[PDB]
């Protein structure tokens, strides 16, 4: 008997790891073939899931904790001798006090932060790398825990954009009671 779980987890390793790595300038990629049409309006587009509110909240903690996670990047080494175990470690101590949305992108960022210095070192190979041991820890460290909380249909609901927005709505609209009081 044996068992597994989603990809999707795996899908916003690399979705983010993508934007931290372009925001420094990189990128590298590769083109392909299928089978597909279209006729409306081509366009920009965008979401509003997972994406896009990763994404920012990634952005917005090395903002309010630059030194919270700055001294973070600076706790692993990451090198081709280096091994899986010494990642789900680190990780361990800054996920040991319980676990919440906070930490996990502040985490998610950590990652980011160790291929930005490995392509710095022409290492960028190990992006795969750290990019397959997240997969590993999210499934295997967290999963159980997003399962908990409402996946992430909550995280966005929360702390993301039309999360964002939607806050303000009342807000400004209770503002409007007490002084139509
Ligand atoms: O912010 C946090 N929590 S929150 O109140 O739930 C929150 C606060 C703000 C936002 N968003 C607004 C932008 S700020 C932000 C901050 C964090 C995440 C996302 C956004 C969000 N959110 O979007 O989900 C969540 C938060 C932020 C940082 C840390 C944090 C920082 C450094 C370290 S170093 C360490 C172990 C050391 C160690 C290292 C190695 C080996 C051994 C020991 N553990 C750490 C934990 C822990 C929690």
């Known amino acids: 008997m044996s068992m597994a779980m989603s990809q999707s987890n795996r899908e916003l390793v690399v979705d983010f790891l993508s934007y931290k790595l372009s925001q420094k300038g990189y990128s590298w990629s590769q083109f392909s073939d299928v089978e597909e049409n279209r006729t409306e309006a081509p366009e920009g587009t965008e979401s509003e899931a997972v994406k896009?509110?990763?994404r920012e909240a990634g952005?917005?903690?090395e903002l309010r904790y630059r030194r919270a996670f700055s001294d973070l990047t600076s706790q692993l080494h990451i090198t081709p001798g280096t091994a899986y175990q010494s990642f789900e470690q680190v990780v361990?101590?800054?996920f040991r006090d319980g676990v919440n949305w906070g930490r996990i992108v502040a985490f998610f960022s950590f990652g980011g932060a160790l291929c930005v210095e490995s392509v710095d070192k022409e290492?960028?190979?190990?992006?795969s790398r750290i990019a397959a041991w997240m997969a590993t820890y999210l499934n295997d460290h967290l999963e159980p825990?997003?399962?908990e909380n409402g996946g992430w249909?909550?995280?966005?609901?929360?702390?993301?954009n039309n999360a964002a927005?939607?806050?303000?709505?009342?807000?400004?609209?209770?503002?409007?009671?007490?002084?139509?009081?």
């Open 52 to 54: 896009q509110a990763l």
């Open 59 to 61: 952005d917005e903690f």
């Open 92 to 94: 361990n101590e800054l």
């Open 123 to 127: 290492m960028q190979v190990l992006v």
């Open 145 to 147: 825990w997003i399962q």
């Open 153 to 160: 249909d909550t995280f966005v609901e929360l702390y993301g």
């Open 165 to 181: 927005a939607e806050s303000r709505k009342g807000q400004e609209r209770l503002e409007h009671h007490h002084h139509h009081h």
